[PDB]
Amino acid sequence: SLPKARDQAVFPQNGLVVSSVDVQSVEPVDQRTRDALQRSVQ
Amino acid sequence: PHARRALCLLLGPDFFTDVITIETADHARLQLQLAYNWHFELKNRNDPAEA
């Protein structure tokens, strides 16, 4: 379509097609990414 | 080595949720979960030898 890839993630084994992939929120779990990037906030 | 046992040999596409313990050139010991998208292949599904 740098450039956009496609709009279809097909598995030929069973015909399962992942039309799109959606990721909700980046958690990072550790408390040190946490209120240390919070000093970055400040 | 020997955990599962079944009467049927699954020929359909499947996967193995295997984890390896590899080591890179920087000696970085990391385990990593694999899939191994596999499927059996038979060009002539009647021949006794190939089957």
Curated annotation (Swiss-Prot), chain A:
Where is the protein situated, by its record's location annotation? Cytoplasm; Nucleus
Q: What does this protein do?
A: Required for normal vault structure. Vaults are multi-subunit structures that may act as scaffolds for proteins involved in signal transduction. Vaults may also play a role in nucleo-cytoplasmic transport. Down-regulates IFNG-mediated STAT1 signaling and subsequent activation of JAK. Down-regulates SRC activity and signaling through MAP kinases.
Tell me where on the tree of life, at the top rank, the source sits: Eukaryota
Portion of the full-length sequence here: 609 to 659 of 861
Domains: entry comment? MVP 3 mediates interaction with PTEN. MVP 4 mediates interaction with PARP4.
Identify the species of origin: Rattus norvegicus
Free-text description of this protein's post-translational modifications in UniProt: Phosphorylated on Tyr residues after EGF stimulation. Dephosphorylated by PTPN11.
Stretches that traverse the bilayer: none
- Which protein are we looking at? Major vault protein
What assembly does the database describe for this protein?
The vault ribonucleoprotein particle is a huge (400 A x 670 A) cage structure of 12.9 MDa. It consists of a dimer of half-vaults, with each half-vault comprising 39 identical major vault protein (MVP) chains, PARP4 and one or more vault RNAs (vRNAs). Interacts with TEP1. Interacts with PTEN and activated MAPK1. The phosphorylated protein interacts with the SH2 domains of PTPN11 and SRC. Interacts with APEX1. May interact with ZNF540.
UniProtKB/Swiss-Prot annotation, chain B:
Q: How is it modified after translation?
A: Phosphorylated on Tyr residues after EGF stimulation.
Where does this protein reside within or beyond the cell?
Cytoplasm; Nucleus
**Organism domain of life:** Eukaryota
Q: What does this protein do?
A: Required for normal vault structure. Vaults are multi-subunit structures that may act as scaffolds for proteins involved in signal transduction. Vaults may also play a role in nucleo-cytoplasmic transport. Down-regulates IFNG-mediated STAT1 signaling and subsequent activation of JAK. Down-regulates SRC activity and signaling through MAP kinases.
Anything noted about its domains? MVP 3 mediates interaction with PTEN.
User: How is the quaternary structure described?
Assistant: The vault ribonucleoprotein particle is a huge (400 A x 670 A) cage structure of 12.9 MDa. It consists of a dimer of half-vaults, with each half-vault comprising 39 identical major vault protein (MVP) chains, PARP4 and one or more vault RNAs (vRNAs). Interacts with TEP1. Interacts with PTEN and activated MAPK1. The phosphorylated protein interacts with the SH2 domains of PTPN11 and SRC. Interacts with APEX1. May interact with ZNF540.
- This chain's protein is named Major vault protein
